[PDB]
Design a protein around this nucleic acid. Structure first.
Ligand SMILES: [Mg+2]
Ligand SMILES: [Mg+2]
Ligand SMILES: [Mg+2]
Ligand SMILES: [Mg+2]
Ligand SMILES: [Mg+2]
Ligand SMILES: [Mg+2]
Ligand SMILES: [Mg+2]
Ligand SMILES: [Mg+2]
Ligand SMILES: [Mg+2]
Ligand SMILES: [Mg+2]
Ligand SMILES: [Mg+2]
Ligand SMILES: [Mg+2]
Ligand SMILES: [Mg+2]
Ligand SMILES: [Mg+2]
Ligand SMILES: [Mg+2]
Ligand SMILES: [Mg+2]
Ligand SMILES: [Mg+2]
Ligand SMILES: [Mg+2]
Ligand SMILES: [Mg+2]
Ligand SMILES: [Mg+2]
Ligand SMILES: [Mg+2]
Ligand SMILES: [Mg+2]
Ligand SMILES: [Mg+2]
Ligand SMILES: [Mg+2]
Ligand SMILES: [Mg+2]
Ligand SMILES: [Mg+2]
Ligand SMILES: [Mg+2]
Ligand SMILES: [Mg+2]
Ligand SMILES: [Mg+2]
Ligand SMILES: [Mg+2]
Ligand SMILES: [Mg+2]
Ligand SMILES: [Mg+2]
Ligand SMILES: [Mg+2]
Ligand SMILES: [Mg+2]
Ligand SMILES: [Mg+2]
Ligand SMILES: [Zn+2]
Lengths: 48, 204, 149, 104, 159
RNA sequence: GUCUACGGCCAUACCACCCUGAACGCGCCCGAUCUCGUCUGAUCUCGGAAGCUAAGCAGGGUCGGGCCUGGUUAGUACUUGGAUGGGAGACCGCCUGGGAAUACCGGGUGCUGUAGGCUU
RNA sequence: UGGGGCGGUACACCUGUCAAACGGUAACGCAGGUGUCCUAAGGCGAGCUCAGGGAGGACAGAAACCUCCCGUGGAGCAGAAGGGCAAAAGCUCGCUUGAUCUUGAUUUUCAGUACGAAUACAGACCGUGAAAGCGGGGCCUCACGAUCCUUCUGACCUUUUGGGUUUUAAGCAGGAGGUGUCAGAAAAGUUACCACAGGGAUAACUGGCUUGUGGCGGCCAAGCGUUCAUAGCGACGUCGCUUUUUGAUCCUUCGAUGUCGGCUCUUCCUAUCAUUGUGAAGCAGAAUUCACCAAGCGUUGGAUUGUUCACCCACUAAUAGG
RNA sequence: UGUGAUUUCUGCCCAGUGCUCUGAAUGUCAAAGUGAAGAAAUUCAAUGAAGCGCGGGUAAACGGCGGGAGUAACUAUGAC
RNA sequence: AAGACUAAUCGAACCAUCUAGUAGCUGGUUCCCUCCGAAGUUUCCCUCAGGAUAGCUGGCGCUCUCGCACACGCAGUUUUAUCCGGUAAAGCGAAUGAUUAGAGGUCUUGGGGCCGAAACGAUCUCAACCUAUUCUCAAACUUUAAAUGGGUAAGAAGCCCGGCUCGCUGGCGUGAGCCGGGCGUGGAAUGGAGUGCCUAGUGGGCCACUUUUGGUAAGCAGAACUGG
């Protein structure tokens, strides 16, 4: 009892059938991952 | 032990030559690639006649040797033992695998039985070098040889001088002017760029 | 039995069905597109009479996302007179002489729905050098229009 | 491998580097009054046989080494557990790997 | 079946070109990478620290962070239909500014000027690119000579 | 015209061998008390200024080797898309578009930024 | 799992290629490797040059040791391969222990989850350096493992049940004890006395595609034939047909196509054993050998053996093949 | 429990496995019991049955019962 | 002693109940019209005749906007600029590796030997060997180097002017953030976009051009591209 083992045959039809949507960009992106020592001063500047 | 050659005629698989990855193969049946008075200067044997291919296929070492011998025999019997020089311009670098079924179809990867040579269209297989009064004998020799190969080949005379790469009409003037030197079975072209001490040695 | 890249380029040119037709202006951008869908079309360099016969007979408008016939000039002017186009001839001028306001005049028009060639075609699967119909058949396009219309 | 018997590393009590002494870690007894074995007894008591699995199929041939550090400073006497990659042979404070010499 | 190593299939990419091995010419380091800049990526394999993955070799991105020796970059990636955005930290010697916007910048500045000056004139002149148009009816001179005459040639079995 | 210190681009700047080098420089060069290190003041460190272009460096030369760049090779090899085209097959030709590399033949042989000297 | 069993591990991992110039991409596809090793082979600083080749020097020789010149890496850097490195990442010396303590973010495989491995930052304590600086393991790419349970370390840490004190036990946070069928059950055989649900998703006959092997036949012609390439044979080479041999495959058939051989009976084919009509010889005659038209009529009796095949006796125009 | 009238015979092996004998004189070897420490649960120590090991006997008990080389006045064989 | 007989039943009789025992497996599943309309692929499982996970599909909506004299946003598309790659072909008088033949080298080790006491007196040669040339090769070699391809950019989330805050950094200064003003078409051709819940059936595949691996080949086995 042997079988198929891998295929990427039909898939591009499936992908484009709903589309390939680039991400939704915005202004005022998020500050997740930046340097702590720089982020800190931003607070103090806005705090005064 | 040997098969026919319809099983291995077409250029199907990629090259699989003899190297550190492929080991365990015998040698080839041909070992000599040129015959006749192979020392003659460029002036004695100016005429060249070739055998040319017309297919993209594979030729075996056995075929080359058989062809080599048939031509030598007649060419001797016609002209002489030293009226010519013959050269073969192919080498058997590609290898052939065999799967021997004494499991079935499991673990299929053959053993290196054989060697063979590949051909492109326009390539050259055989060439002869001799004099002009022996033209038709040269043609007759090669014609006996085509019956040893699997395909359709054809014959032509070259405009060149011998096994060189210069046109005959130009060669003879061009050696009497110190551009071409007869250094052996060939020549040596020299341009007007080097250092003059080689222009001093010549012209003296 | 058509390819995705080619299915795209046709439906930009609004050719979503057999024996439809549209005008178009020519530049490096357009011409390369036509090389891509060469085997499926047949194009040419038309004259004035063909522009007349198309628009009057088989020529309709796009209005409110509907398809409405050009019977009177009220329709044209009301939708298209801000460009200085108030009648049929003003289009034909704007089309035949590719004007400044071509885009709007053409996109006002619905793609022409034509009938099959009276008399027959030679062989649609080949180019118009090998006895076929495809590719560019520059001035002979008009000979064909006489028989589709 | 080889490891010397001392070093200087961080004491998480004193807040500094201080010298330590070194010895290998072994494993202790089982104490017989933990909630694990008490359960396993109340369950394994009676008729029924064996109740919880047993392990039989081994693969490993080594063990990760574990060290035990002790601050020499009195009035700290803090200890830690430190770890090393795997090894088949181990040794505390052997030779010094002399270079340039002859081997007989 | 293939493996999952991080450098499978990089014999040539993470390989220095011909007669350019050696130390690094260090105007690479002295460049200035501020926030919002558009950047392309190219893994130098002469130094191994901070180099990105295969999938980002040849991609272009945008800065969001700045460290002492590296940069943070926002890069898109197509993986099974949906596209994702990704934040890879990368060291300097694997990057380079991109000239893929300087053309735009030459225009807007020339275009601002060319509007403001030559505004008093009154004409709204061209300001926006147009494609290559058709090609300008014109004459051709035969300054005397009749043209040459070509024809084909006979075949020859030259080899 | 040119040098010194620091450099960027890293052979149009490299390799071999020959000619010339005014002034300022750069070096060779003379010693080892103290500084310093050597099996050995050869290298490295220090204190010096009798003599010298021999060398290094600078420029220049070679029907020079290499390097940079053109041409030819060649609209060749190969190649996207197409056909109820050929052919026993292997493979070939055509329509629509793109388009290389050797051999061979020519030319060139360091550009410069900052600070400071000589060239009265 | 090219039916299953025996064999192997393609069952968790690494390099190159196949793979069609982003990435990704299969088969019991090719070639190879792993379950380790290191108090330095980790980390800082300084100084120097490798492989080999040439010419010389008391014993000295192909090779001990000394010196000079050339030397773009042609040597080494623990291991498989691949990349990368010259006043280094290599060789040698001096000092040391960033192979330490602690949060969170990202990448890789991927569902965009975990393990593992890796990267760039921040806070501490430190080491080396004149200082810039570098270092939180091995130049990079692989070297490893959940809950439940047990053991150890830590805080003058919470709870132990109506309150208080001491011991024990339970808790919190971090390491280790291990699962190789490597996202993780605790596990030997036989059945010809056997049984059930299913299967043509899968084998033992026919049929079908292929024709390696088996059989039959052409091409050219070095030699045989005393002489004489071709009366008759024919090396080394090469082009083909057939399905009366055995294989490869697994399309139909598992709610059933009755599985060897002899007896019996009919028809058909030709790749002609003989008989009719002819040609050719190394055809004197008689016997024999090659070939052409041709499938009309014939091709037997018996010992042995289950025999298909084999083998011997006897007669016959002949004792041919399917 | 095994062989299977009569006649004539029943060969060697106690290493393996089973069975069997003794045995305080030797390791190991449970509950209860004995004693020391602790505030008490508890811990520690000494003690120590059969059995397993130490040692003997048994094959009409399961069963098992080998290779190389040289060698005889012609060769070949091969008592040695 | 044959696993034979025990009421036509025996490698564990028959009767009732537990009992509608369990079944990842076979067979069956009851009227119409309209509308939309698939997969046979990823990762994990003592997983391979099966489940979970994502993908493919439907339904229910909601926020916006337009030929409403009135706009932004999108895209298996082309263009203009700009980066990435090491496959076809080519190359070996360029590196690694393989290989043929003769000219100038007894380079040079020795000779079935060689004219000879033999030597490098000669003279050859051979396994290799210096110099300049020569015939043929590479899936796991390469200086060179395509065609088709992949990623960015093409403006209001932009440009400019002026001023404020900062334990961050510091020759003086940079950088980031906040405030207040001035300036609208920014290449082609197309069309209405966005966002959120519930959710089924599937999870055995097959063929053709072109590229392509094993095999003598296959209506054979395994893959990439598009279409059926
Ligand atoms: Mg499947
Ligand atoms: Mg193949
Ligand atoms: Mg009619
Ligand atoms: Mg017709
Ligand atoms: Mg078609
Ligand atoms: Mg009990
Ligand atoms: Mg590749
Ligand atoms: Mg001195
Ligand atoms: Mg000088
Ligand atoms: Mg001089
Ligand atoms: Mg030159
Ligand atoms: Mg199985
Ligand atoms: Mg590809
Ligand atoms: Mg150093
Ligand atoms: Mg190191
Ligand atoms: Mg730190
Ligand atoms: Mg209580
Ligand atoms: Mg209490
Ligand atoms: Mg039996
Ligand atoms: Mg055969
Ligand atoms: Mg079958
Ligand atoms: Mg089947
Ligand atoms: Mg199948
Ligand atoms: Mg029946
Ligand atoms: Mg029947
Ligand atoms: Mg016949
Ligand atoms: Mg007995
Ligand atoms: Mg007996
Ligand atoms: Mg015994
Ligand atoms: Mg029985
Ligand atoms: Mg039921
Ligand atoms: Mg089923
Ligand atoms: Mg199942
Ligand atoms: Mg190639
Ligand atoms: Mg679903
Ligand atoms: Zn301490």
């Amino acid at each position: 009892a042997k079988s198929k083992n891998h295929t990427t045959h039909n898939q591009s039809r499936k992908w484009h059938r709903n589309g390939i949507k680039k991400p939704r960009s915005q202004r005022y992106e998020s500050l997740k991952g930046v340097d702590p020592k720089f982020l800190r001063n931003m607070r103090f500047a806005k705090k005064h | 032990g040997r098969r026919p050659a319809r099983c291995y005629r077409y250029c199907k698989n990629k090259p699989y030559p003899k190297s550190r990855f492929c080991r365990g193969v015998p040698d080839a049946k041909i070992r000599i690639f040129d015959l006749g008075r192979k020392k003659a200067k460029v002036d004695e044997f100016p005429l060249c006649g070739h055998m040319v291919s017309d297919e993209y296929e594979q030729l075996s070492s056995e075929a080359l040797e058989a062809a080599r011998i048939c031509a030598n025999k007649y060419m001797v019997k016609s002209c002489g033992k030293d009226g010519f020089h013959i050269r073969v311009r192919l080498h058997p670098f590609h290898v052939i695998r065999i799967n021997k079924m004494l499991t079935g179809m499991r673990g299929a990867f053959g053993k290196p039985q054989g060697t063979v040579a590949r051909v492109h269209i326009g390539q050259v297989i055989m060439s002869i070098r001799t004099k002009l009064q022996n033209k038709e004998h040269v043609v007759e020799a090669l014609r006996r040889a085509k019956f040893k190969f699997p395909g359709r080949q054809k014959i032509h005379i070259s405009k060149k001088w011998g096994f060189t790469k210069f046109n005959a009409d130009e060669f003879e003037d061009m050696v009497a002017e110190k551009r071409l030197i007869p250094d052996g079975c060939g020549v040596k072209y020299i341009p007007n760029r080097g250092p003059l001490d080689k222009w001093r040695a010549l012209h003296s | 039995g058509v390819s995705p890249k080619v299915r795209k380029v046709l439906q930009l040119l609004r050719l979503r069905q057999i024996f439809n037709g549209t005008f178009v202006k020519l530049n490096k951008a357009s011409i390369n597109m036509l090389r891509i869908v060469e085997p499926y079309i047949a194009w040419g360099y038309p004259n004035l009479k063909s522009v007349n016969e198309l628009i009057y007979k088989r020529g309709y408008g796009k209005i409110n996302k509907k398809r409405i016939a050009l019977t009177d000039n009220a329709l044209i002017a009301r939708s298209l007179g801000k460009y200085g186009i108030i009648c049929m001839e003003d289009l034909i001028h704007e089309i035949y002489t590719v004007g400044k306001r071509f885009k709007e005049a053409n996109n006002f028009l619905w793609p022409f729905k034509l009938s099959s060639p009276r008399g027959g075609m030679k062989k649609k699967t080949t180019h118009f050098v090998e006895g076929e119909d495809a590719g560019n058949r520059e001035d002979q396009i008009n000979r064909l229009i006489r028989r589709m219309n | 491998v080889n490891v010397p018997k001392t070093r200087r590393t961080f004491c998480k009590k004193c807040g500094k580097h201080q010298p330590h002494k070194v010895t290998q870690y072994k494993k202790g007894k089982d104490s017989l009054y933990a909630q694990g074995k008490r359960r396993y007894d109340r369950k394994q008591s009676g008729y029924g046989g064996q109740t919880k699995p047993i392990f039989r199929k081994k693969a490993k041939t080594t063990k990760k080494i574990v060290l035990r550090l002790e601050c020499v400073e009195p009035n700290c006497r803090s200890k830690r557990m430190l770890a090393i990659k795997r090894c088949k042979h181990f040794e505390l404070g052997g030779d010094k790997k002399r270079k340039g010499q002859v081997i007989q | 079946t293939n493996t999952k190593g991080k450098r499978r299939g990089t014999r040539y990419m993470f390989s220095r070109p011909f007669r350019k091995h050696g130390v690094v010419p260090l105007a690479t380091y002295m460049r200035i990478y501020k926030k919002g800049d558009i950047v392309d990526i190219k893994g130098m394999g002469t130094v191994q620290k901070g180099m990105p993955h295969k999938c980002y070799h040849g991609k272009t991105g945008r800065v969001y962070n700045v460290t002492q020796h590296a940069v943070g970059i926002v890069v898109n990636k197509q993986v099974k239909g949906k596209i994702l955005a990704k934040r890879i930290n990368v060291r300097i010697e694997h990057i380079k500014h991109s000239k893929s916007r300087d053309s735009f910048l030459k225009r807007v500045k020339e275009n601002d000027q060319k509007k403001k000056e030559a505004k008093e004139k009154g004409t709204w002149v061209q300001l926006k690119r147009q494609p290559a148009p058709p090609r300008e009816a014109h004459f051709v001179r035969t300054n005397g000579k009749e043209p040459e005459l070509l024809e084909p040639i006979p075949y020859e079995f030259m080899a």
